[PDB]
Write a protein that binds this ligand. Structure first.
Ligand SMILES: CN(C)[C@@H]1C(=O)C(C(N)=O)=C(O)[C@@]2(O)C(=O)C3=C(O)c4c(O)c(NC(=O)CN5CCCC5)cc(F)c4C[C@H]3C[C@@H]12
Ligand SMILES: [Mg+2]
Ligand SMILES: [Mg+2]
Ligand SMILES: [Mg+2]
Ligand SMILES: [Mg+2]
Ligand SMILES: [Mg+2]
Ligand SMILES: [Mg+2]
Ligand SMILES: [Mg+2]
Ligand SMILES: [Mg+2]
Ligand SMILES: [Mg+2]
Ligand SMILES: [Mg+2]
Ligand SMILES: [Mg+2]
Ligand SMILES: [Mg+2]
Ligand SMILES: [Mg+2]
Ligand SMILES: [Mg+2]
Ligand SMILES: [Mg+2]
Ligand SMILES: [Mg+2]
Ligand SMILES: [Mg+2]
Ligand SMILES: [Mg+2]
Ligand SMILES: [Mg+2]
Lengths: 100, 126, 82, 100, 215, 143
RNA sequence: CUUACCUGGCCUUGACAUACUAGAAACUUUUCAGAGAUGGAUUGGUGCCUUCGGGAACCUAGAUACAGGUGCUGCAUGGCUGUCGUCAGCUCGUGUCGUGAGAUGUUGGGUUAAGUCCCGCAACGAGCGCAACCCUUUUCCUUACUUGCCAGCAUUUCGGAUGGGAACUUUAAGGAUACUGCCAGUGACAAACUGGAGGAAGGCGGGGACGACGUCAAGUCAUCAUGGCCCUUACGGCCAGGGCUACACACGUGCUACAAUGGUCGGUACAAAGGGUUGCUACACAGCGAUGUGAUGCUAAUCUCAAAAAGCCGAUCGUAGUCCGGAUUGGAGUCUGCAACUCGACUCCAUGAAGUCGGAAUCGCUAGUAAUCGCGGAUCAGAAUGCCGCGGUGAAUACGUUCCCG
């Protein structure tokens, strides 16, 4: 991938990490019943006011060695191109060729 | 008093056979309650009917796994082994009838590049 | 559609612009990129120029348009026939 | 009835069996009575990986990874059993958990 | 046609993995990425020490790295300063404290990766590739391999059109699963591009299987 | 096949009446593996005919299949004598095909109707048998 | 967002590395303008190492060598991959005839899945291919007795629920078995091929991985690396809106149907494989429903996704464009997301299109196969009729190699 794209990903991750706590508090306030509708409305408005990169919906899983945005395989944190090589070199514990 | 195990298509049956008058129970249910087809009942009844000893023994059976046909076949196989254990000399008759052989047929796995075990995609001819 | 329990969604900056326009009687069109905002009763009697991708199309809000998104009145694609 | 429960997890059934037998031998030498090991069901996780870099859908490697679990129960434990069990070293690749 | 990886096809048959550790589904990716980073760092730092194999374990909140080398003195240093620095750096890279172990390769000529590295160095220094392949083959066979095969692909001698050529001697039963077959690949970076070098060494058949290997 | 010959696939007899012929016809009737519905159709038709006229179902079915069974064929075009298995297969296929096109609502009673028609002597299967006989006579001289 | 494309708004040693110089702990609280990128204000604080006259981490400002490019060349390359094709071939030594290149072995009779094997022969012998070594399924044995099991005893709020048992099932490690082994034909008396007995299984028992020398300048510079060309106030970098979802048409691959072997309703059975802690959720209540609220147990052979559906029994529909089919559209909602107009999935009421089995042509399949029915997962906030797996019910037909294809 491109280095600018990788750095965009890293910046978005940092923003999410920064805003994790306040966003969760706002969601809890919105979902609280005892609080008045005024407070819930204000919480929703603040949530909408939070910067966009605070939302985890925008994070895209990328390879980790090459930044490839397709074929991710969460369990290994690697895209298929590097996963095949690392598995067939014997550097991924417990993984073999499957036959049944 | 005697025991047998039967296996057919992921189904396993435990058959307890004792001298009796002809009572048959499967999972605390009668044959007609447990199996809805007549073919399943006839398959269950084949061995004793062949031996002409239907009213001679009592059958207490549990089964689990597979479908209705598989369960019927497993019950037949288990009854056959129980009868052989009770009297080895029945083995020639049962092996002639084919109840001794354990059917090893099973579902073939799906294969990469195919819709099923052997069905391929459609191939446009240019 | 957006669940009734959450109410309608309007961008805060657009809402502030509309509030200012209603407070002070000004008919100057309001320029926005917010196609996703929902048209409210307060918009009626106003002119909003809504981005379509390359231009800001003017829209005069009426009572019939209430309950719509601003982008519904600013088509994005151009077609005239093969 | 101060029984102890040991749970072993591994990606190599030979390694986990060796570790379980070592634990059983240590317990028996210490003098306690042991139950097991009991084989718990295995987890099999499969994966499909395109082998070509650009385009060949049918060209794939099939990989699998296996998680094996073993359970050991020690009953009527002697005071000398626990210290020996703690002394017993840790073998790489075999996760061991102990519950009192 | 394309060939399966000789190491990969035998991973549970007659050969071990290069990594031994258990992890939960959540920790598996973190552990893998850290291990790969460690491998990449070590290769660069010990390029000139004739390193072939790296074995990584995470026994319990710790790390153990075993390095198979033909020059243990270079890695160890004068009085252990090099190993201490390396241990500290790996303990920095990996969260848990780490330990380092040295495994001396007594016979470099039966190690596939060292042979490929030597061939690549010669090609980058512009030795004739046919001479390189013949000399490597004869050296390995004197070392005592039951078979040796070497392949070189690219712009040989800076030709405009690339080509591939190979030399084999002895026997190399690739289809035999229980055969001990070391395999390695290597890059030679020349003014005209990249030349790929591949080495296979057949050392006999392992009898008894995994149980004999004592996993 | 080019090399070797494959043995015939043994078919277990019908459990109720112990008739391999009945089992073969039942499999001919079956679609999509719905053996239970095929069994219902066939047993119902046999019971209906038995009740209507008192005759052994197996004997009557064999007798009717004898009437509907063909005699000759032509292979690509030279006439040839059909083998016993192909005779029965063609007969059963013709009966089921003619039933498929019959105009009655259901299949079981509509199968019994065709059985009676074939027994009497007039039917689509009998007409097809006569047609193949005519065409074989027309190509008689060859071979 | 992804995003590489378009419109407009912006930055320039740069979003990212190294070297040089100066000042500042990093950080942290609230506002304002702007669509945002940005710009300008406004709070709290002076650690960690020190031979303390300094230095480490991280920032701000200057500076040039540079960074940056999914820009071009798959015909300059590495690595990787498709295909003939799991087709049975491709070779090498030394001898041998030939002035010679070469031949031979590797050719011939049978046989096999096979250059598989046995027979002949101035050839003798060996390598890479074939086979076997590996995984899975069928029979049995030993070890193991829970969270899994319940034959025999008892206790039962009749639920293995309890006291209990280690028998059976299963779970999962290690072993045995099958080898033309025995028999009769058969054939050159050989290889080999047919038919019997025992056996769970009898002639590679069934599947899977394993891809020879080579061919197509075959595919990939957009996974990645890399020679050489190009851009450098932009061919680099940041942002908000739009597009990748267009629509007079033509092709490939699928799903749903055209109904009675069926549709609707009531009752009632039987699986295997996976998944689950920012997750799956028992149960109660609210709603017609998608769902919501409270609450419970599960880091799982323990709790849960979970209703298997075809099936069976009963009634009704009686061949109608219908009680078949469910496209299109009008209203009204739910959930995920900062946000469902362009452009989500699902739910309810209303509407109810084409379609009554499809020309020439053409495709898959030899057995637990085809056909048919349901169930799970990777990707993933949400978004499968695709892909990769799992089980249930369960056929027809092979006379033969003339004809098409390789
Ligand atoms: C139908 N289509 C798939 C073809 C097809 O059918 C077949 C086949 N065998 O069937 C194939 O070979 C192909 O696919 C293919 O791959 C080809 C090439 O690469 C190629 C190439 O690279 C250059 N290169 C240059 O001219 C470089 N010059 C240097 C200076 C300026 C240009 C020139 C050139 F004519 C070709 C021919 C193509 C043909 C192509
Ligand atoms: Mg790059
Ligand atoms: Mg996403
Ligand atoms: Mg299936
Ligand atoms: Mg299977
Ligand atoms: Mg496909
Ligand atoms: Mg709507
Ligand atoms: Mg976009
Ligand atoms: Mg090419
Ligand atoms: Mg191209
Ligand atoms: Mg092989
Ligand atoms: Mg080309
Ligand atoms: Mg390109
Ligand atoms: Mg954008
Ligand atoms: Mg598209
Ligand atoms: Mg019914
Ligand atoms: Mg309907
Ligand atoms: Mg019409
Ligand atoms: Mg075949
Ligand atoms: Mg999903």
């Amino acid at each position: 991938a491109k280095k600018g794209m990788i750095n965009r990903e890293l910046k978005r991750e940092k923003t999410v990490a920064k805003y994790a706590a306040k966003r969760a508090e706002l969601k809890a306030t919105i979902a609280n019943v005892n609080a008045s509708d005024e407070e819930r409305f204000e919480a929703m408005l603040k949530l909408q006011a939070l910067p966009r990169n605070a939302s985890p919906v925008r994070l895209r899983n990328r390879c980790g060695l090459t930044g490839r945005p397709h074929g991710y395989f969460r369990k290994f944190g690697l895209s298929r191109n590097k996963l095949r090589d690392t598995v067939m070199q014997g550097d991924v514990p417990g993984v073999v060729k499957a036959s049944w | 008093t005697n025991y047998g195990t039967g296996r057919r298509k992921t189904a396993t049956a435990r058959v307890f056979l004792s001298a009796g008058t002809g009572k048959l129970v499967i999972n605390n249910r009668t044959l007609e309650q447990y199996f809805g087809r007549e073919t399943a009942r006839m398959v269950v009844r084949q061995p004793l009917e062949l031996l002409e000893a239907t009213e001679k023994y009592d059958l207490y059976i549990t089964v689990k796994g597979g479908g209705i046909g598989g369960q019927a076949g497993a019950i037949r196989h288990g009854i056959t082994r129980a009868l052989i254990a009770a009297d080895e000399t029945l083995k020639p008759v049962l092996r002639q009838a084919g109840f001794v052989t354990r059917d090893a047929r099973e579902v073939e796995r799906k294969k990469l590049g195919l819709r099923k075990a052997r069905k391929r995609p459609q191939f446009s001819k240019r | 559609p957006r669940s009734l329990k959450k109410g309608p969604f309007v961008d805060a900056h657009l809402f502030a612009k509309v509030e200012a326009a209603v407070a002070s009687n000004s008919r100057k069109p309001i320029k926005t990129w917010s196609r996703r905002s929902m048209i409210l009763p307060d918009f009626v009697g106003l002119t909003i120029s809504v981005h379509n991708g390359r231009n800001h199309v003017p829209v005069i809000v009426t009572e019939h348009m209430v309950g719509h998104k601003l982008g519904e009145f600013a088509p994005t694609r151009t077609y005239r026939g093969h | 009835n101060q029984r102890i429960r040991i749970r072993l997890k591994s990606f190599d059934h030979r390694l986990i069996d060796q570790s379980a037998q070592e634990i059983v031998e240590t317990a028996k030498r210490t003098g306690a009575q042991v139950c097991g090991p009991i084989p718990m069901p295995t987890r099999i996780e499969r994966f499909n990986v395109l082998t070509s870099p650009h385009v060949n859908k049918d060209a794939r490697d099939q990989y699998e990874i296996r998680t094996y679990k073993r359970l050991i129960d020690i009953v009527q434990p002697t005071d000398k059993t626990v210290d020996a069990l703690m002394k017993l070293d840790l073998a790489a690749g075999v996760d061991v958990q102990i519950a009192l | 046609g394309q060939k399966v990886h000789p190491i990969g096809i035998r991973l549970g048959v007659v050969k071990r993995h290069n990594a031994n550790w258990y992890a939960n589904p959540k920790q598996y990716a973190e552990y893998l990425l850290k291990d790969l980073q460690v491998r990449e760092f070590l290769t660069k730092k010990l390029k000139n020490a004739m390193v072939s194999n790296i074995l990584i374990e995470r026994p319990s909140g710790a790390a153990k790295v075993t390095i198979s080398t033909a020059r243990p003195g270079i890695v160890i240093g004068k009085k252990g300063e090099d190993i201490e620095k390396l241990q500290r750096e790996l303990t920095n890279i990996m969260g848990v404290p780490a330990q380092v172990s040295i495994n001396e390769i007594d016979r470099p000529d039966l190690d596939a990766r060292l042979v490929a590295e030597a061939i690549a160095s010669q090609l980058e220094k512009r030795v004739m590739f046919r001479r390189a392949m013949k000399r490597a083959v004869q050296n390995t066979m004197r070392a005592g391999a039951k078979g040796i095969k070497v392949e070189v692909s690219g712009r040989l001698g800076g030709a405009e059109i690339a080509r591939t050529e190979w030399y084999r001697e002895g026997r190399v039963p690739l289809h035999t699963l229980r055969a001990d077959i070391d395999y390695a690949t290597m890059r030679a970076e020349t003014t005209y591009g990249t030349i790929g070098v591949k080495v296979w060494i057949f050392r006999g058949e392992i009898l008894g299987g995994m149980k004999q290997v004592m996993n | 096949p080019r090399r070797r010959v494959v043995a015939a696939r043994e078919i277990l007899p019908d459990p109720k009446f112990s008739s391999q012929t009945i089992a073969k016809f039942m499999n001919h009737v079956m679609q999509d593996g719905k053996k239970s519905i095929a069994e219902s159709i066939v047993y119902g038709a046999l019971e209906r005919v038995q009740e209507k006229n008192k005759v052994d179902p197996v004997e009557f079915f064999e007798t009717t299949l004898e009437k509907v069974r063909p005699m000759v064929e032509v292979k690509a075009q030279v006439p040839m004598e059909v083998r016993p298995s192909r005779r029965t297969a063609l007969a059963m296929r013709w009966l089921v095909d003619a039933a498929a096109k019959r105009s009655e609502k259901t299949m079981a009673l509509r199968l019994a109707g065709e059985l009676l028609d074939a027994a009497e002597g007039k039917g689509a299967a009998i007409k097809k048998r006569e047609d193949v006989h005519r065409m074989a006579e027309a190509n008689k001289a060859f071979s």
